[PDB]
Ligand SMILES: Nc1ncnc2c1ncn2[C@@H]1O[C@H](COP(=O)(O)OP(=O)(O)NP(=O)(O)O)[C@@H](O)[C@H]1O
């Protein structure tokens with residue numbers, strides 16, 4: 178009926194596209210998993226599916242999938258890197274990766290990337306290529322059949338207690354319950370080969386904490402009520418609001434692709450801000466389908482406040498500020514503030530098709 182509901186209709190994924198893309202991705206991922214198990218270093222890899230497709234908040238087309246290839250490293254000892262809260266040294270067939278007693282993130286990622294590159298070349302039945310290494314990413318990115326991108330992130334799995342920098346994160350007690358928080362923090366955590374900033378460069382030995390699996394569990398079990406979105410009387414608009422925030426940023430980045438001020442914004446910024454708004458608004462009655470426009474406004478104004486105050490804490494690691502001036506210039510946040518305010522004040526013309 179409404180403008181926003183019409184936008185959501187256009188953002189829905191086609192069942193046929195899903196069927197084709199799911200089969201294509203599974204074939205390639207399962208192949209690489211099998212072949213990586215042949216290498217002595219990656220003998221123990223397992224699959225975890227992550228990101229927006231597996232949280233059912235992928236929009237427009239199923240053409241971008243995220244997966245972790247995780248390895249359990251028992252007796253893992255961590256050392257936080259230079260008070261960064263999110264980046265760590267890992268102290269420790271893995272010997273090829275040691276730089277001292279440090280298990281080098283870049284060394285492992287390099288070898289991981291090299292094995293995958295050699296293995297996709299032998300896939301003659303399918304058209305699979307490696308995309309160029311994108312700086313700062315822990316992923317190795319594939320393109321299947323010129324159309325579907327798959328980001329494969331190497332991860333070390335730890336079944337130890339989560340690091341102390343997470344003690345005050347995951348503030349879900351009033352929304353999803355204290356007992357759920359306790360259950361989630363008994364799950365493993367992951368380290369991925371995303372390196373801390375060091376000057377104008379990177380500390381290439383360091384790893385980054387990742388809780389992508391907890392983000393998926395929260396998105397796929399997202400209500401105060403256990404039956405949220407399982408029946409026609411409890412269809413909340415939380416996922417719709419995240420889809421609309423993602424589309425707002427996707428559209429602005431496309432329009433402003435030649436404007437440097439939008440380069441460092443990402444869908445993870447809107448995902449993080451969305452989790453915070455869920456913490457702020459914990460009741461399912463604050464996400465009623467009939468209030469879609471108000472709920473989406475709640476999300477837009479929260480994100481605008483994050484930009485203006487330069488505060489967007491990582492949801493798991495509260496002293497890691499994604500909107501720190503060390504990461505994004507004030508001028509760039511003000512620029513995005515300007516464009517989002519324009520959309521809010523004009524009923525989101527960037528959502529119009531014509
Ligand atoms: N900067 C980051 N910090 C922590 N985790 C991240 C970061 N970027 C990506 N991730 C994780 O990796 C997943 C996949 O990344 P990405 O493909 O960029 O996002 P997405 O959520 O799948 N959104 P999209 O692909 O645009 O629909 C995210 O959902 C996060 O769980």
Ligand SMILES: O=C(CNC(=O)c1cccnc1C(=O)O)Nc1ccc(F)c(Cl)c1
Nearest residue numbers: 243313314315316328330369371385386387
């Ligand atoms: O840091 C990054 C940079 N982002 C990307 O490379 C990107 C860009 C466009 C689409 N997708 C992606 C992707 O990452 O999937 N990603 C990241 C991934 C897993 C993690 F556990 C952590 Cl901590 C960070």
Ligand SMILES: [Mn+2]
Nearest residue numbers: 228229241243
């Ligand atoms: Mn994705």
Ligand SMILES: [Mn+2]
Nearest residue numbers: 228242243328
């Ligand atoms: Mn991705």
Ligand SMILES: [Zn+2]
Nearest residue numbers: 400405406413
């Ligand atoms: Zn719901």
